[PDB]
Design a protein around this motif. Structure first.
Motif, PDB file in Angstrom:
ATOM      1  N   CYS A 751       0.823  -1.198   0.000  1.00 40.48           N
ATOM      2  CA  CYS A 751       0.000   0.000   0.000  1.00 40.48           C
ATOM      3  C   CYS A 751       0.863   1.256   0.000  1.00 40.48           C
ATOM      4  O   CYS A 751       1.975   1.268   0.532  1.00 40.48           O
ATOM      5  N   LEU A 752       0.327   2.324  -0.590  1.00 43.26           N
ATOM      6  CA  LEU A 752       1.043   3.587  -0.712  1.00 43.26           C
ATOM      7  C   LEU A 752       0.026   4.705  -0.873  1.00 43.26           C
ATOM      8  O   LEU A 752      -0.829   4.637  -1.761  1.00 43.26           O
ATOM      9  N   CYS A 753       0.119   5.728  -0.031  1.00 42.30           N
ATOM     10  CA  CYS A 753      -0.856   6.806  -0.038  1.00 42.30           C
ATOM     11  C   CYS A 753      -0.446   7.907  -1.014  1.00 42.30           C
ATOM     12  O   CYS A 753       0.461   7.739  -1.835  1.00 42.30           O
ATOM     13  N   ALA A 754      -1.137   9.042  -0.930  1.00 45.33           N
ATOM     14  CA  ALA A 754      -1.048  10.087  -1.940  1.00 45.33           C
ATOM     15  C   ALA A 754       0.259  10.864  -1.837  1.00 45.33           C
ATOM     16  O   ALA A 754       0.782  11.087  -0.741  1.00 45.33           O
ATOM     17  N   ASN A 784      -9.625  -4.875  -1.737  1.00 40.83           N
ATOM     18  CA  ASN A 784     -10.021  -5.979  -0.864  1.00 40.83           C
ATOM     19  C   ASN A 784     -10.091  -5.534   0.590  1.00 40.83           C
ATOM     20  O   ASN A 784     -11.046  -5.864   1.302  1.00 40.83           O
ATOM     21  N   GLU A 785      -9.094  -4.775   1.046  1.00 48.41           N
ATOM     22  CA  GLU A 785      -9.000  -4.327   2.426  1.00 48.41           C
ATOM     23  C   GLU A 785      -8.615  -2.851   2.472  1.00 48.41           C
ATOM     24  O   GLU A 785      -7.871  -2.381   1.597  1.00 48.41           O
ATOM     25  N   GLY A 789      -5.357   3.355   6.117  1.00 42.11           N
ATOM     26  CA  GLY A 789      -6.272   4.021   7.019  1.00 42.11           C
ATOM     27  C   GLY A 789      -7.605   4.410   6.422  1.00 42.11           C
ATOM     28  O   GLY A 789      -8.472   4.905   7.153  1.00 42.11           O
ATOM     29  N   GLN A 790      -7.803   4.206   5.122  1.00 41.11           N
ATOM     30  CA  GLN A 790      -9.059   4.515   4.458  1.00 41.11           C
ATOM     31  C   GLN A 790      -9.319   3.450   3.405  1.00 41.11           C
ATOM     32  O   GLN A 790      -8.443   2.647   3.085  1.00 41.11           O
ATOM     33  N   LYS A 791     -10.543   3.444   2.877  1.00 39.74           N
ATOM     34  CA  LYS A 791     -10.887   2.530   1.793  1.00 39.74           C
ATOM     35  C   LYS A 791     -10.180   2.957   0.513  1.00 39.74           C
ATOM     36  O   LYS A 791     -10.261   4.121   0.109  1.00 39.74           O
ATOM     37  N   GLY A 792      -9.474   2.017  -0.108  1.00 36.74           N
ATOM     38  CA  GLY A 792      -8.666   2.360  -1.266  1.00 36.74           C
ATOM     39  C   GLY A 792      -9.520   2.547  -2.507  1.00 36.74           C
ATOM     40  O   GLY A 792     -10.443   1.777  -2.776  1.00 36.74           O
ATOM     41  N   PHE A 793      -9.205   3.590  -3.266  1.00 36.06           N
ATOM     42  CA  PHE A 793      -9.901   3.896  -4.504  1.00 36.06           C
ATOM     43  C   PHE A 793      -9.057   3.436  -5.685  1.00 36.06           C
ATOM     44  O   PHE A 793      -7.827   3.510  -5.662  1.00 36.06           O
ATOM     45  N   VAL A 794      -9.733   2.937  -6.713  1.00 35.37           N
ATOM     46  CA  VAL A 794      -9.098   2.435  -7.920  1.00 35.37           C
ATOM     47  C   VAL A 794      -9.428   3.401  -9.053  1.00 35.37           C
ATOM     48  O   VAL A 794     -10.602   3.705  -9.279  1.00 35.37           O
ATOM     49  N   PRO A 795      -8.433   3.920  -9.789  1.00 33.60           N
ATOM     50  CA  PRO A 795      -8.730   4.864 -10.878  1.00 33.60           C
ATOM     51  C   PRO A 795      -9.281   4.199 -12.129  1.00 33.60           C
ATOM     52  O   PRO A 795      -9.537   2.991 -12.154  1.00 33.60           O
TER      53      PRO A 795
END
Length: 1212
Positions: A751-754, A784-785, A789-795
């Motif tokens: 995982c990797l944030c903005a 999936n998870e 810390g937040q629900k991941g968005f898919v572009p």
């Protein structure tokens, strides 16, 4: 009423141009006939023929310029004659016709290239009126860092004044500063080639611009910006330092950047020298930013001068002159210390004159302009001085502390020639005026109604003069019947590219008493091109791989040359600039007055100085002259080097729109263009940018060279610039060309944030040689998870990325370079030699690289430097002897190598003829030759030997007197003594001249070596007299220098008894450097010249010694500072003497050689070396398993062929 004429024309005339002449007529006349005609040594052409009218008439015509008689210079006579009804006015002035410099530049697509790539370049010639000329190009050459002309283009034509050429570098092309030289002149374009990798970030100073002593603490803001504009995160180390005039006073800061991307820190100057004059007041700031994870670093330098001025004010819009009894106006621009401008500031103005010193106080406005209008009634026509200061007091100039002084403005004003009581003034139009737009000037006047008289309607004649030529003309009539008062009017002016950056403008008025009232101002126009070129991108920020619309706007019928480059290759090196400063910079020589060949003045402020200050020739009979004073997925394979190198034709619309595909990179493409119309002229676009950007992608940190067999680190940094937290999944591809030792064995989901970068590391071992591809694909995993810390968005776009990066792989171990040489020099017969390519068998496979290189002429650079050595003569000092020494040796080498053109030989022997008289009167009357003046001092024995050497080898060229030879013979008849040498007496104590060590036996070698080049030989008693001091002195040898001079004195003596003992410590002590071997211990070139000249004495020589000497001539040939630079007094003459004896012994230049190489497995190659490609250093790789090779050559001339076996060995 006395009628008068005026004639104006330019002073400096240019042949590819049309110029303007103007004649101004008073009322009256009309029965006389005024002509102005240009006359010269071979013709006389008609410029203007006119009869006058009842008004002031300004008649202006355009005329074509005559060609120069000398080809580049002419003093033509301009003649004004008024005939008819028993009166004949006649006056002659002089003008200069010269061919101006056609300004030539060369640009490349990049300043920096990898091996194995192709250099593109464009070559432009210019006229001074900014229209490009289609002139013929003689030869364009592309030279090595080792100064071998590897490429040459002969007889190339420019279409629309520009020519685009290309050259392919080798895959094994060596690293250095290659050169593109044009038309045997000054046009050089250098491009560097080395092994590099592209950086993705620049680092810059932001907050420290300039530093002053007024403040107590300042701020440094180091900002690291990526090449596509996004901010980054990393570790910053900043080093500020002060230069010592000694420990350097320095301060080191460190930190980490933020989401903004700039790191800031306060710096106090208690550390730096702010007390007095101890160190240099020049602070150096060096920032180093290491990117996190990948570890690639960038540097950033900044040199800031410590400013000791709090402010500075100048006279930006003020005339040099004042009209007497009439008000004066001016502006004062008051500037601070760090690009700041003082608002409502106090200005202390003081005026000096013969009346005394008078006081004025002033306040500015909130722009920074400071207006003053004053009265010059009390100045009574005297020279005054304007002075402006800041306040009433001043800061103390302490000689032991740091000075904080101001910049008080000073101006000197001289009155106008007051032959009339009328006023004419021009209100100025501030600083930088926009080109092409019509501007308006306001010009005011006051005609006094007692000298000019009311009944004549007055006319004001206005001239707009740019670059020393009458650009725009006119005259306006205004009625003066009203007994007129102070009024004003306006004029419309348009500034174009024909107008200067600093054009001038004169309004005059002639009165019937002969008095002139006039005023001249100067302008400030920005540096313009007549072809307005707009290079634009639509939509100027696109994902890489999609098309963009490139719009080129210029004149109709234009050729637009376009260059689009990556920003990263500009971040390695700054390229050669192409802006309005650069194009205007190579031209101007008109800066000010008349040329010095043509300016005639009478000597022990008027209209004559007004026209002289712009450089405009002018003649009249009126009182215009003052009398003389006595003072979703995307695969990324792409080219990172040059996007666009296409010429484009422009139709009649003036605009051309094309679709171009952005290369698959996340970067900024800096694009620029320049266009050509023959009608309008040259144009140049401002440098625009295209940011190619993707939100989520992959970058690879990898070196461009990986040595085989062992591991190296590969870093895959994944970048996210979206506004959500995403679970990426990276996959390194698997191939047989490389291997990995399972650093988490790929398939890495994380995982990797903005606005974040995540690095993966691998240790890869290279297995396959050559250019191999590293392939990686990243995908966005589904939600999936809720990671991060937040629900991941898919572009929806750019979900997948795939990068393919090539890398050069080199074989392991050290590189053995086994070299063999050959000089295939026949004389009209086939000549067959052979080489052997053998190796010890401990080698790695696929490492055997061999190539055979043929070169026609050994000297491959500075051929025109020999012919250009004959210039800049003198007649005084010891500089004349050193500058006129090597011309004899240069012309001896030219006549022994088939290049003696008779015109340059005749010019050089004329120069040596006028220099032989300037060197003949340096003779001492004791029998030696003096140095500084006649009979000044007895010089050393080396000076006498050198003047008899340069006199005794000139009788094949120039009549030299023989009497000084007999005087010198009687001079050293007492100098050498058998019971001890080294009588010495006198020495050269001259600026930047020392020569050699010049002890006893070295000076004996000079006097017994330089004295025999008059055609003399052995049976002389003086070589035996010098030999008696060397019978025991040959055993000592006095290090490598004097064993080389003793080798020289017994090499020409002809005996072998004490010759060969010291020859077993000379040749084997050579510094072996490839096929360019030499000797070392200024100094090294002198020793190599001495060794080469020592070998080339005896007549018993063979092929191997000739090929070894060919290698020595090759190393001496690939130098620019040996000849053409006369810094050392016995380097150039001895080196050219050794080259002359090498041309004497066997070598001749290659006229036409057919050569063919042969192997044992049916492989042959044929080279043709004619008289025009003999300078081309041309090679060929060998595809065979290395072994026996045969070579043969035929024709006329000699060719030097060397073969190299470069392989790699695994090390025991």
């Amino acid at each position: 009423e006395l009628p008068n004429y005026l004639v104006t024309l330019p002073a400096r005339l240019n042949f590819p141009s049309v110029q303007k002449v103007c004649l101004d007529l008073s009322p009256g006349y009309s029965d006389v006939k005024f002509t102005v005609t240009l006359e010269t040594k071979d013709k006389t052409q008609k410029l203007l023929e006119y009869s006058g009218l009842k008004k002031r008439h300004l008649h202006c015509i355009s005329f074509l310029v005559p060609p120069p008689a000398g080809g580049t210079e002419e003093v033509a006579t301009i003649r004004v004659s008024g005939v008819g009804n028993n009166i004949s006015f006649e006056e002659k002035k002089k003008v200069l016709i010269q061919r101006q410099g056609n300004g030539t530049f060369v640009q490349t697509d990049k300043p920096l290239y990898t091996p194995g790539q192709q250099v593109y370049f464009r070559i432009v010639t210019m006229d001074s009126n900014f229209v490009p000329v289609n002139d013929k190009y003689s030869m364009v050459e592309l030279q090595d860092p080792n100064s071998n002309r590897i490429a040459q283009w002969l007889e190339v034509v420019p279409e629309q004044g520009i020519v685009d050429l290309s050259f392919q570098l080798a895959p094994e092309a060596m690293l250095g500063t290659y050169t593109v030289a044009v038309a045997e002149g000054k046009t050089f374009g250098t491009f560097s080639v080395e092994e590099y990798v592209l950086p993705k970030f620049k680092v810059e100073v932001v907050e420290p611009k300039e530093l002053s002593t007024v403040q107590e603490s300042f701020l440094v803001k180091i900002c690291c910006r990526y090449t596509y504009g996004k901010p980054m995160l990393g570790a910053v180390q900043v080093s500020v330092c002060q230069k010592a005039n000694l420990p350097d006073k320095c301060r080191n800061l460190s930190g980490q950047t933020d989401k903004t991307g700039c790191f800031s820190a306060p710096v106090d100057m208690a550390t730096f020298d702010l007390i007095g004059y101890a160190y240099s007041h020049q602070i150096n700031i060096v920032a180093t930013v290491v990117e996190e994870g990948t570890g690639v670093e960038a540097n950033a330098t900044q040199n800031i001068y410590i400013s000791p001025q709090m402010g500075s004010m100048t006279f930006e819009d003020t005339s040099n002159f004042y009209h007497p009894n009439f008000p004066f106006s001016g502006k004062i621009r008051v500037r601070g210390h760090d690009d700041s401008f003082l608002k409502n500031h106090l200005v202390f103005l003081v005026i000096y004159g013969t009346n005394g010193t008078f006081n004025q106080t002033l306040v500015t406005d909130n722009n920074g302009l400071a207006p003053f209008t004053l009265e010059t009634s009390g100045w009574n026509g005297t020279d005054v001085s304007l002075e402006g200061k800041f306040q009433m007091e001043d800061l103390v100039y302490n000689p032991e502390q740091v000075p904080r002084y101001y910049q008080n403005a000073y101006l000197h004003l001289r009155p106008f020639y007051s032959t009339t009581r009328s006023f004419l003034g021009i209100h100025r139009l501030n600083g930088p005026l926009k080109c092409g737009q019509p501007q308006e000037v306001l010009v005011d006047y006051y005609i006094d109604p007692a000298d000019a008289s009311p009944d004549q309607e007055i006319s004001f004649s206005y001239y707009l003069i740019g670059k020393g030529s009458l650009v725009m003309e006119g005259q306006k009539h205004l009625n003066s019947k009203k007994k007129g008062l102070k009024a004003s009017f306006s004029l419309s002016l348009t500034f174009t590219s024909r107008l200067a950056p600093d054009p001038s403008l004169v309004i005059y008025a002639i009165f019937p008493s002969g008095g002139v009232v006039a005023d001249k101002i100067q302008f400030s126009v920005e540096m313009c091109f007549d072809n307005q070129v707009s290079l634009g991108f639509s939509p100027s920020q696109q994902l890489p791989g999609a098309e963009v619309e490139l719009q080129l706007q210029a004149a109709p019928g234009s050729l637009c040359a376009l260059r689009a480059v990556d920003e990263s290759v500009l971040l390695l090196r700054p390229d050669r600039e192409l802006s309005n400063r650069s194009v205007y910079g190579m031209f101007p020589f008109w800066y000010g007055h008349y040329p010095y060949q043509v300016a005639e003045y009478d000597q022990c402020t008027d209209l004559f100085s007004f026209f002289r200050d712009v450089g405009l020739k002018i003649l009249s009979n009126a009182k215009i002259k003052k009398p003389v004073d006595c003072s979703d997925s995307q695969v990324r394979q792409y080219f990172p080097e040059t996007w666009l190198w296409d010429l484009f034709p422009i139709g009649n619309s003036g605009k051309e729109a094309v679709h171009v595909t952005v290369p698959d990179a996340i970067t900024e493409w800096k694009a620029m263009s320049f266009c050509t119309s023959q009608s309008r002229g040259f144009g140049l676009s401002p440098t625009v940018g295209l940011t190619a950007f993707k939100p989520f992608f992959v970058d690879l940190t990898l070196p461009y060279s990986v040595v085989r067999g062992e591991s190296f680190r590969l870093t895959a940094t994944i970048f996210n610039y979206l506004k959500d937290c995403i679970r990426v999944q990276t996959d390194l591809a698997k191939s047989h060309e490389y291997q990995l030792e399972s650093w988490a064995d790929s398939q890495t989901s994380s995982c990797l944030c903005a606005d974040d970068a995540k690095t993966h590391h691998w240790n890869i071992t290279a297995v396959k040689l050559g250019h191999i591809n590293f392939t990686i694909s990243t995908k966005i995993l589904d939600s999936n998870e809720p990671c991060g810390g937040q629900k991941g968005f898919v572009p929806q776009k750019g979900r997948s990325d795939t990068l393919i990066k090539p890398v050069l792989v080199k074989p392991e171990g050290v590189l053995v370079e086994k070299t063999h040489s050959s000089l295939l020099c026949p004389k009209g017969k086939v000549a067959s030699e052979s080489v052997s390519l053998e190796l010890p068998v401990d080698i790695v496979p696929d490492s055997t690289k061999a190539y055979v290189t043929v070169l026609g002429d050994i000297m491959g650079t500075a051929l025109q430097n020999l012919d250009g050595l004959v210039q800049m003569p003198s007649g005084c000092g010891e500089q004349n002897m050193v500058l006129f020494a090597p011309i004899i040796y240069v012309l001896q080498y030219l006549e022994k190598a088939g290049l003696l053109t008779e015109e340059i030989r005749s010019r050089a022997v004329g120069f040596l003829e006028i220099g032989y008289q300037k060197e003949l009167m340096y003779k001492h009357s004791n029998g030696s030759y003096s140095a500084f003046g006649e009979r000044d001092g007895n010089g050393n024995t080396w000076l006498t030997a050198f003047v008899t050497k340069c006199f005794g080898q000139a009788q094949k060229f120039i009549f030299i007197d023989p009497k000084n030879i007999q005087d010198a013979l009687k001079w050293m008849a007492g100098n050498q003594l058998p019971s001890g040498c080294y009588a010495n007496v006198g020495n050269l104590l001259h600026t930047a001249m020392k020569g050699g060590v010049d002890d006893e036996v070295s000076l004996t070698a000079y006097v017994t070596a330089a004295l025999l080049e008059m055609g003399k030989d052995v049976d002389d008693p003086m070589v035996s007299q010098g030999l008696r001091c060397l019978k025991n002195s040959a055993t000592s040898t006095t290090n490598l220098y004097t064993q080389a001079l003793l080798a020289y004195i017994f090499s020409l003596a002809g005996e072998m008894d004490i010759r060969n003992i010291l020859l077993k410590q000379l040749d084997q002590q050579a510094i072996i450097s490839g096929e360019s071997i030499y000797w070392s211990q200024a100094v090294d070139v002198e020793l190599t010249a001495y060794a080469l000249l020592a070998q080339l004495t005896k007549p018993s020589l063979t092929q191997k010694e000739i090929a070894k000497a060919t290698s020595i001539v090759a190393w001496l040939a690939k130098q620019h500072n040996a000849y053409g630079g006369f810094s050392s007094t016995q380097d150039t003459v001895v080196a050219l003497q050794a080259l002359a004896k090498y041309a004497t012994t066997a070598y001749m230049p290659s006229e036409e050689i057919n050569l063919v190489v042969k192997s044992t497995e049916n492989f042959q190659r044929t080279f043709n070396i004619q008289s025009v490609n003999r300078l081309v250093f041309q090679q060929d790789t060998l595809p065979n398993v290395p072994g026996m090779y045969t070579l043969e050559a035929s024709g006329q001339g000699c060719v030097y062929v060397q073969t190299v076996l470069r392989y790699n060995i695994l090390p025991p």
